[PDB]
């Protein structure tokens, strides 16, 4: 599997984020994060570099080449969906970065390095950066960098933007509300979508969860993991025991068999913002964020940089867009209680997006 490091990192990141946010809706693009952090890693040296390699799961020496190849695959023209990943480097106009870093970053990340005036016009630069991301995401991520995130000490902002719009291979019927069980003391009504279709469905006994694949048109699918636990979300077991080995066997090998499935899932939309320094530090990436210990001499031979924060913003809008059967003997997948979901690029086996839906 040519995306294994990114998937290992995605699951560990999810777990660490789940300590910060144990029960509420969560949604992120681990692909986006990995690509941003690979650009930052290119610039790192010494212990900073060593820690980043461990954390990003590169140790589990042609890392940048892999990113370019994965990125080409994800960006490959299809008529089946819109899917775009783009990297961008914004640099202080008066700073002098290593020519080899600027060259190699463009070569492997296509980040089109661009000068901006953090030193004297940090707020305008913040705005320019946000506006760039806004465009790349078709308006969906309008203000990536919050107020106060960039200042006269900022020297570089490394950015990835990812955009996906697809239709289901088979449309859902909008049921024209069902109680969604939020926790043992709360049910909330949600708009359900229904589909009866030939679909891959299985059960992961180690995680006590059903798994369902809902394909988009083209080689992207959403996988849903639905526990069948606790008095809270019902996800504790799944979230703590999920691993690469456990998941990959079911998403990417052929443990799932096709059957006629009656599927009920909510129509939902999430928008989540994270600041990942604390999470990343907790994962083992300490020196990068340590103003006195960081080594980014790959980016500048003056060795006068550190990573102050990693801002992530992600959103998803899930809806219906894509006779005479009355038996109900076979499989049901009724997502009326919390579940994990991920959007998988099937060719690369990369996880593009990963989330927990728990609260309508």
């Amino acid at each position: 599997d040519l995306c294994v490091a990114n998937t290992l990192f995605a699951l560990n990141l999810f777990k660490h984020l789940a300590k910060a946010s144990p029960t509420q809706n969560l949604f992120l693009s681990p692909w986006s994060i990995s690509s941003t952090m690979a650009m930052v890693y290119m610039g790192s040296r010494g212990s900073t570099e060593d820690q980043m390699a461990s954390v990003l799961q590169f140790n589990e020496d042609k890392i940048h080449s892999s990113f370019r190849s994965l990125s080409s695959a994800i960006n490959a023209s299809t008529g089946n969906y819109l899917l775009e990943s783009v990297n961008k480097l914004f640099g202080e106009k008066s700073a002098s970065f290593r020519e080899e870093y600027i060259r190699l970053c463009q070569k492997y990340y296509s980040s089109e390095p661009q000068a901006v005036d953090f030193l004297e016009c940090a707020e305008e630069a913040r705005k320019k950066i946000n506006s760039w991301v806004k465009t790349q995401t078709k308006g969906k991520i309008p203000n990536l960098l919050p107020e106060g995130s960039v200042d006269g000490d900022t020297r570089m902002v490394l950015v990835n933007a990812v955009y996906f719009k697809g239709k289901w291979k088979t449309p859902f019927e909008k049921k024209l509300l069902f109680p969604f069980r939020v926790n043992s003391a709360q049910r909330t009504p949600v708009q359900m979508m229904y589909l009866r279709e030939k679909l891959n469905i299985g059960y992961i006994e180690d995680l006590k969860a059903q798994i369902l694949e809902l394909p988009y048109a083209g080689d992207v699918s959403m996988f849903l993991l639905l526990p069948d636990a606790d008095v809270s979300t019902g996800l504790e077991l799944l979230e703590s025991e999920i691993t690469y080995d456990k998941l990959n066997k079911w998403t990417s090998k052929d443990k799932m068999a096709e059957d006629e499935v009656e599927v009920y899932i909510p129509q939902f939309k999430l928008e989540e913002h994270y600041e990942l320094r604390s999470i990343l530090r907790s994962m083992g990436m300490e020196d990068a964020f340590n103003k006195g210990r960081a080594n980014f001499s790959g980016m500048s031979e003056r060795n006068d940089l550190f990573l102050s924060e990693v801002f992530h913003q992600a959103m998803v809008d899930v809806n219906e867009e894509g006779t005479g059967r009355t038996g109900h003997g076979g499989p049901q997948f009724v997502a009326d209680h919390p579940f994990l979901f991920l959007i998988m690029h099937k060719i690369t086996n990369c996880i593009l997006f990963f989330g927990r839906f728990s609260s309508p």
Binding site: L28, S29, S32, I33, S35, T36, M37, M39, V40, G43, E92, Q136, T137, K138, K140, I141, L144, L145, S149, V150, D151, D153, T154, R155, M156, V157, L158, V159, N160, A161, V162, Y163, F164, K165, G166, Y216, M222, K291, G292, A294, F296, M299, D304, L305, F306, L307, S308, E309, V310, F311, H312, Q313, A314, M315, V316, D317, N319, I343, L352, F353
Partner: peptide, 14 residues
């Protein structure tokens, strides 16, 4: 499904 994300790493001078 429409989905999107931005990620920004901020490098600061010391």
């Amino acid at each position: 499904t429409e989905a999107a994300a931005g990620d920004g790493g901020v490098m600061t001078g010391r």
